[PDB]
Amino acid sequence: ASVYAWNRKRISNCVADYSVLYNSASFSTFKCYGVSPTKLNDLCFTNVYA
Amino acid sequence: SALGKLQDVVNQNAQALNTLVKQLSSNFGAISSVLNDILSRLDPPEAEV
Amino acid sequence: DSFVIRGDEVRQIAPGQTGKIADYNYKLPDDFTGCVIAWNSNNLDSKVG
């Protein structure tokens, strides 16, 4: 989607293997604020909004 | 109320302690007032700050 | 300590970094003291084949 019409996807009731993201070489920018991505594997959340 | 002079003393001490305990609930500028959460959410580079 | 990497992974040569190079190839200490110097070597290390 266009930036002015950014799409929002809700993530819930699932297991998030964040390794697939932070072990991938397909990303040039990967910046997490307020969290460290390694520790995401040990964390749960009530709302995920991609 | 006759023994107020004694009661006051007690109360004051208690009050002090209470505030001290409640000071554990303040972030003081951090991102969370619970040390365990900061240790579980950040790596040392910024967890130290 | 001398070696060669690819440009995208140059960021990984720094304290508190993650990725392929830092985790599996070369890891600096979090309190590292010293200098890191890096420069492109396309003219020298690349081959047509």
DSSP characters over B21-43: HHGGG--TTSS-S-HHHHHHHS-
Among partner residues C8, C18, C20, which is closest to A28 by beta-carbon distance?
C8
The answer to whether the beta carbons of residues A2 and A44 sit under 8 Å apart is no
- Burial (CB < 10 A; 0-12, 13-18, 19+), residue B43, is middle
- Burial (CB < 10 A; 0-12, 13-18, 19+), residue B4, is exposed
Place of tokens 């959340």: A45
Q: Is A38 in Cβ contact with C18 (below 8 Å)? A: yes
Name the pairing type of β-strands A10-11 and A48-49: antiparallel
DSSP C1-49: ------GGGGGGSSTT--SHIIIII----TT--S-------HHHH----
The answer to whether the beta carbons of residues B36 and B42 sit under 8 Å apart is no
Q: B42 in contact with A at a CB cutoff of 8 Å?
A: yes
**Solving technique:** cryo-EM
Q: Chain C residue closest to B43 (CA)?
A: C16
Among partner residues B31, B40, B43, which is closest to A34 by beta-carbon distance?
B31
For chain B, what is the total number of helices (H) and then of strands (E)? 3, 0
Question: Measured between alpha carbons, how far is C11 from C19 in angstroms, rounded to an integer?
Answer: 9
Q: Which residue in B43, B46, B48, B49 has the most chain A C-beta atoms within 10 A of its own C-beta, making it the best mutation to test that interface?
A: B43
User: How many other CB atoms are there within 10 angstroms of residue A49's CB atom?
Assistant: 7
**Residue B32 zone, left/alpha/beta (φ > 0; ψ -120 to 50; rest):** beta
Q: Is B40 in Cβ contact with A42 (below 8 Å)? A: yes
Cβ neighbors of C26 (< 8 A, separation 6 or more) are: C1, C3, C13
